[PDB]
Design a protein around this ligand. Structure first.
Ligand code: ZN
Lengths: 94, 107, 362, 98, 80, 95, 108, 81, 98
DNA sequence: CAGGATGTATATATCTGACACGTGCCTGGAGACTAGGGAGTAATCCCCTTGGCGGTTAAAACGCGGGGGACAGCGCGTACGTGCGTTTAAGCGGTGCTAGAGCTGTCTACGACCAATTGAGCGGCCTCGGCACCGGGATTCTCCA
DNA sequence: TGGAGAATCCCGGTGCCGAGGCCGCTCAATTGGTCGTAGACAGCTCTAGCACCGCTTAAACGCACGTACGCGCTGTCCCCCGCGTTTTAACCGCCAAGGGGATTACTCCCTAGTCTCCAGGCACGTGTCAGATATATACATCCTG
């Protein structure tokens, strides 16, 4: 009677993608929620700050990309940027 | 003559939810407007990072001849990555334990 | 008539007597190579020989002057891309690897260039064996159509050993195998989880070149699990031991493998049939086999003809699943012409109706 | 005579044991008592969820372990194996809490 | 009502072992007890502030998690 | 064209002459004061935003600002700043 | 009608601008609505803090026989106050220098 | 440009050390200081260049630097803040 | 013979002089050259405002001074007066940059 | 060295409770359309960045003598670790209780929105006073019998 | 415990440039009014923190023995510091050219807002199997004559 949402469905799907024989405890699935929420808040705060510095009023893919380049280290940023660009390219073909 | 719905995560080809992140972006006081390609990018990044951690986590789980991933395995995954350990340098994991190390002088 | 079969196996055991000395001398030089490769400075620091046993049941072998070993090399984070949508050939890429991949010179863009890496391997192995001349051992290079570097040893006489590179991945047994190795109802789920928690292997082999990307294709290898199952061939893991019951499983495997070996070599048009065919068929027969009493040397001939029946029924309906990759089923006409399989059926009938004459050699 | 171990072997065994576990190393009733007594200075008649106290205990143990690591580093620096309050004070001064 | 002596000496030895410490002077315990007390005072001050703002009587896990996150010591595993 | 920009220099000057009627100030010190005021303004505003968001509310009130000030400043600075703020709010509500 | 205007800081009795702070609070993406007494709190606290800094800074500038504040005096003020040094603990002051302090073991 | 880290002369590391309060300095300290300064500068300039490129400018302004420092916990007063 | 000062007096005078100034202690052309050369790896044909380089110089000098303070503290801890790279490494390890 | 005692990882047998499915459903996400406003673009100015030159002197660089500090070695004694026997109290399970959190409904005061005035704050101009800056004597402070 | 060199502050005069004041102006805060909605109360539920009681037993504690480590002393030997000479190249002033940020004007397309609808995610209920535990072995390591 106090319906509260989380990310565990999608985390479970991704897990079944990368390791389709492994389970997960009930505390680790809370830890993944906390992790996702943390990264979400970081990226969103950084994109907000970026849009404020550039006198814009909207948040676009360019802000998200620059925020990711600001926050991820080394080859993580390269792979994340490639993933993001591939995703946007696939979405626009619709 | 309807257009039976097709989720945005399906269009992007992702598992993470695009509409829920869109809603959280709008009701979160981040900007006045939100573009159409920002949630796809962010969900792709979140899914990539999740897969990147979870694979090494299932590996650390399956190293100790275990079936379920526990927090000890998540912690070992975090600390055994010279970038993930810099991204999560000041985070504490409950029931995570410590990194096994002994100083050479103490042997 | 199981007595002649038992004695031909004994004949192989006197081969085995010759091949203990031949295999020991070749084994010792390759072991020496192993010791030397760990000391030389190159991208090949940790390269073990993969031990699949020494028996004929354990390794590639034929006429006494060729031996085979598997060399393993651990590889960083690997992502596979199916190229043969059967599910048998792949393109190889890497993953993030934040510190650095000491293999980037082996890649054409984002894909690993098997050609370049194999050329560097060939060069290094040939130079290293060239650097110590205790036993007379040299390298022979044939056309680069099958990637194996063969040493020729003059000790006592010609010994050839094809060194086959195998990539070592510990990651996840990719999705193409997800419902391979079905043994849950025969042995148990705990072995299968433990077995499938083992690593898997990638070997260079240029899939016949109706393709652009050449050399850059790889085949799956599961030699270690296959050896493990074979040396625990029974529902009881005590097989081949004093703790258990003598059965005709290893005997039937040798009977069919050796019979096919001799019959197929004497009619050389059918050389596309390799030893993996018999291992796959016998894997299916041993898994469907519920009874230990259905494999016992007193039943060598009956288990063998039942196995023959299994082989003909497998040929008949035009499908034999790769036991680890049911989606990749090699019995497709595009790689084995139907008429050639039926000709093999006729040759098999030839063996069955003549009372095993090919065994009547010496 | 019986089986006297030399000083430093049981210490290494305990190091190896506690670098492998994940349990909590402080008793729970003393910690809860201490928490309630400390909190009764900022406001009286307070209540605590059990999860809150468990979180506090986890955080404090992680903090103290992370501080003992730097104390050990300082000890190694001073050409010693025994840790001394000088080293704790140096650690907390460099970390920035002073 | 000391209750700071309830942080015993064996417990401190265990915490030192987990941190890779072999020998411990005898004057280390009262100082690390004071350090821990200082840390707890800060965290509980912030947690009770978060609790009082909601006009509540009980301290929840979220108040502690927020008080921790605002000192750069984020904690995963207790909600949020 | 001339692109008017804002700063807190007038009010810093008023406060200075009101607390020290005789001393002057350089211009780089005024820049430092601007950076300081903007910094801690931002700090308080972000903390109060987060607090209001945690408690399901959608308004920022003097209570939120009060507890954010209690969170950020240490010891007696918070006590005296809270006294100043509350006194000012009382005076204001009295119109 | 339309009685003479009176700034909100005039009623509050302050020198900091209540209208500019109201606008900056309404444009900074902090919440949907902003109460009427929140800018009063914020202007009072900012004014208190700046006056609290400027008192020590003018004192420090006079203790050097100078009638004009420079960045060096602001840092001297900050590093000299025990409570202001915890607030601006992770702040760099341009042209500020350090506090003259020599360890006792180094003196002759 | 090459060999510019050597323009941080030893008497300048010495002057910085004097301002730091140290009385006696070894002779191998200077290479360590050059390396630390180089990696610090790299880490800061990477972020400053990220901000500048995002802004689609070709000159690095002082606000880009101020933001790159602020995002590392090294807020800097006196250049616009 | 003339007026040889003993080792450590001119060092103290320089300490007292540089703890009283606020100027910049690094030459400006070398710093600017180094900055431009470092920046030409992330993107070519860049330009710099003078104020940006001045800010960078101020920040870097403040950083290095703040690090030398902790190096001195570590030196004092090790019962020495000479600073050594071990102490810099310890400082940067405790501070958290590794 | 070489055995002996001890500690720890390793195999089995059993049960459990924690995880994995499965179902009902409701709320939030998707499709379609409109109306505005944010952003993309093109041109232009004019600021400011880059590039050069010449002279100086302050700083760097190189050398040198020497004293003091780093470092090694030896001894001692003491403080901390190991082991044992007692004792306390922590933890666990179960019970009961009620304060207070959490939800629900009502309404009311307060904040959004709009249009018009108006003064506060910004940009520019001018001016004096605080501060460099140089001399020049005072006065510390170091180096000796 | 002196007496002389030598930095360094302090005063004093000059001069200069930057703060402080004036003036002109413009746009944003104020006033006055309207409207909608967030939140404040009042009630009611019902969780879950609190208090208690036994009971077991593991952990703390106190004590003795012993050993190895910190610390202190001594002696040595480099190596940094203080000083003197040379050189070089930042630095300042300066001039020149041009690139690009910043402003204006113009245009378009993408998102909010509304409305209708329906599927995915949540809560609830099962079913079962990974793991915790207990027992029996064997291997690994330390230790001492
Ligand atoms: Zn057998």
């Amino acid at each position: 009677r106090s319906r509260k949402e989380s990310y565990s469905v999608y985390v479970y799907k991704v897990l079944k993608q990368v390791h389709p024989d492994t389970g997960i405890s009930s505390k680790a699935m809370g830890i993944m929620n906390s992790f996702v929420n943390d990264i979400f808040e970081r990226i969103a705060g950084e994109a907000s700050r970026l849009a404020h510095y550039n006198k814009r009023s909207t948040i676009t893919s360019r802000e998200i990309q620059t925020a990711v380049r600001l926050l991820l280290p080394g080859e993580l940023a390269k792979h994340a940027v490639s993933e993001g660009t591939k995703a946007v390219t696939k979405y626009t073909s619709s | 003559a309807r257009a039976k719905a097709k989720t945005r995560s399906s269009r992007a080809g992702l598992q993470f939810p695009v509409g829920r992140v869109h809603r959280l972006l709008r009701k979160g006081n981040y900007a006045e407007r939100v573009g159409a390609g920002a949630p796809v990018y962010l969900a792709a990044v979140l899914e990539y990072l999740t897969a990147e951690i979870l694979e090494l986590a299932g590996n650390a789980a399956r190293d100790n001849k275990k079936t379920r991933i526990i927090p000890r395995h998540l912690q070992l995954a975090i600390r055994n990555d010279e970038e993930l350990n810099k991204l999560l340098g000041k985070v504490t994991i409950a029931q995570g334990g410590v990194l096994p190390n002994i100083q050479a002088v103490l042997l | 008539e199981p007595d002649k079969l038992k004695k031909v196996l004994d004949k192989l055991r006197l081969k085995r007597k010759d091949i203990s000395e031949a295999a020991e001398t070749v084994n010792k030089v390759v072991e020496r190579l192993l010791r030397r490769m760990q000391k030389r400075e190159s991208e090949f620091k940790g390269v073990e020989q993969l031990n699949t046993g020494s028996y004929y049941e354990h390794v590639k072998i034929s006429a006494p002057n060729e031996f085979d070993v598997m060399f393993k090399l651990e590889v960083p984070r690997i992502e596979l891309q199916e190229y043969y949508e059967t599910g048998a050939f792949y393109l190889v890429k890497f993953k993030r690897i934040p510190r650095g991949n000491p293999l980037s010179h082996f890649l054409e863009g984002e894909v690993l260039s098997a050609t370049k890496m194999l050329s560097k391997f060939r060069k290094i192995i040939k130079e290293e064996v060239k650097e110590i001349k205790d036993i007379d051992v040299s390298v022979e290079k044939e056309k680069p159509g099958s990637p194996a570097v063969t040493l020729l040893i003059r000790n006592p006489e010609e010994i050839s050993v094809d060194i086959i590179l195998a990539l070592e991945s510990k990651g996840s047994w990719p999705i193409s195998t997800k419902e391979g190795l079905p043994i849950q109802g025969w042995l148990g789920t705990k072995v299968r989880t433990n077995l499938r928690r083992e690593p898997f292997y990638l070997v260079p082999k240029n899939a016949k070149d109706g393709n652009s990307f050449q050399g850059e294709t790889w085949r799956l290898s599961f030699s270690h699990t296959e050896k493990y199952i074979l040396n625990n061939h029974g529902i009881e893991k005590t097989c081949c031991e004093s703790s258990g019951a003598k059965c005709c499983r290893k005997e039937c495997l040798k009977l069919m493998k050796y019979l096919l070996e001799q019959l197929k070599k004497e009619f050389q048009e059918l050389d596309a049939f390799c030893s993996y065919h018999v291992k796959t068929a016998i894997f299916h027969m041993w898994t469907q086999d519920p009874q230990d009493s259905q494999w016992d040397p007193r039943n060598l001939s009956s288990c063998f003809d039942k196995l023959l029946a299994f082989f003909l029924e497998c040929l008949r309906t035009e499908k034999l699943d790769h036991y680890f990759i049911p989606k990749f089923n090699l019995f497709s006409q595009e790689l084995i012409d139907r008429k050639s399989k039926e000709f093999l059926s006729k040759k098999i009938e030839y063996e069955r109706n003549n009372g095993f004459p090919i065994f009547d050699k010496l | 005579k019986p089986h006297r171990y030399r000083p430093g072997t049981v210490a290494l065994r305990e190091i190896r044991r506690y670098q492998k576990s994940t349990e909590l190393l402080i008793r729970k009733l003393p910690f809860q008592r201490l928490v309630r007594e400390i909190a009764q200075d900022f406001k009286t008649d307070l209540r605590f969820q059990s999860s809150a106290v468990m979180a506090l205990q986890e955080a404090s143990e992680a903090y103290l372990v992370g501080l003992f690591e730097d104390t050990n580093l300082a000890a190694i620096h001073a050409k010693r194996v025994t840790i001394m309050p000088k080293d704790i004070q140096l650690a907390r001064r460099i970390r920035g809490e002073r | 009502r000391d209750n700071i002596q309830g942080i015993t000496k064996p417990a401190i030895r265990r915490l030192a072992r987990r941190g890779g410490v072999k020998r411990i002077s005898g004057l280390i315990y009262e100082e690390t007890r004071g350090v821990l007390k200082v840390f707890l005072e800060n965290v509980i001050r912030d947690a009770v502030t978060y609790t009082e703002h909601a006009k509540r009587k009980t301290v929840t896990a979220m108040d502690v998690v927020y008080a921790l996150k605002r000192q750069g010591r984020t904690l995963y595993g207790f909600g949020g």
